[PDB]
Ligand SMILES: [Cl-]
């Protein structure tokens with residue numbers, strides 16, 4: 488076989504997509520598409536998070552803060568153990584990657 | 597200040613861009629744009645690598661393998677301590693993120 492491992496993420500999605508693609512000892516990488524009016528579950532981050540926004544606008548509410556908007560061209564860091572909500576209110580299509588390191592299991596102890 | 601930390605990456609770049617944006621205890625995230633005919637330095641990966649390709653086509657040569665081509669919509673894993681070369685031969689503009697975890701310093705011991 489090859490040295491590398493390949494994953495594919497959906498291009499030009501126009502529907503809600505939650506792709507939990509990479510899940511290794513060292514990292515998790517997900518690909519998310521949220522059409523306008525959709526949102527992800529409210530939850531506390533289970534690792535250190537970076538949100539790589541490649542299309543549209545995200546409305547991110549953390550803890551007791553007012554909602555903050557981030558557009559394509561932003562990478563947003565959310566610390567471990569922080570209450571978060573991701574919504575797409577303001578764009579036709581919001582597309583981002585979620586990078587988590589280390590794997591949540593490493594922080595569960 | 598805010599709970600989150602924000603970074604910006606260059607959108608719609610048409611020139612060579614090597615943006616070493618995120619560099620934390622836990623992760624590194626870079627944003628790279630290679631116009632046609634450009635390439636990155638040949639080197640051995642200093643952590644576990646994932647290449648998130650969002651535009652164009654990458655020609656990736658690992659160790660003694662023939663060059664392999666990967667297009668937009670691929671995430672490519674390259675293990676730690678592997679000789680690699682990234683080239684853009686076949687597309688006008690190749691754009692990818694590089695996710696590295698854990699931080700290289702953690703593997704340097
Ligand atoms: Cl990994």
Ligand SMILES: [Cl-]
Pocket residue numbers: 535536588620621622623
């Ligand atoms: Cl981090």
